[PDB]
Ligand binder design. Structure first.
Ligand SMILES: C=CS(=O)(=O)N1CCC[C@H](C(N)=O)C1
Ligand SMILES: [Zn+2]
Length: 140
């Protein structure tokens, strides 16, 4: 579990969104596994605006932050899971590292701020839903 809290937005994995998220919806995209809902209080996270390929992510199944090298956001094929059928998840970055359901939500961050959240992984893999192209998260 986990979210990004930037401005009056809460960024979560679409597959983990609650009823309150859907009832206060700003934007959602199934192909990216992302959903954004509105918040009453202002958040403290800042979004990175960059093309970094090295950063650090939080792994809840280890209680640890790990430094990683990651690929650029791409259309990577994701295996059928209980949440989506086999399809091209878009805007996805891969790195070598542990992940278990449970781990989706953990933040990946670079020197500029938050880059994205955990969304894929297994066999020493860990996918990250990028958010750096969502410029509107910084305004309204
Ligand atoms: C089987 C895929 S996985 O990488 O563990 N993961 C499970 C939860 C959903 C993830 C997604 N982003 O589609 C895929
Ligand atoms: Zn960066």
């Amino acid at each position: 579990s986990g979210a990004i809290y930037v401005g009056n937005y809460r960024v979560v994995n679409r597959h983990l969104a609650t009823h309150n998220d859907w009832a206060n919806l700003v934007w959602e995209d199934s192909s990216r596994d992302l959903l954004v809902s509105s918040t009453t209080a202002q958040g403290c996270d800042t979004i990175a605006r960059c093309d970094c390929q090295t950063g650090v992510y939080y792994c809840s199944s280890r209680r640890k932050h790990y430094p990683v090298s990651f690929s650029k956001p791409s259309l990577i094929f994701v295996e059928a899971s209980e949440y989506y059928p086999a399809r091209y998840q878009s805007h996805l970055m891969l790195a070598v590292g542990h992940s278990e359901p449970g781990d989706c939500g953990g933040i990946l961050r670079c020197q500029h701020g938050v880059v994205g959240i955990v969304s894929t992984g297994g066999n020493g893999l860990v996918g990250f839903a990028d958010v750096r192209d969502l410029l509107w998260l910084d305004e309204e």
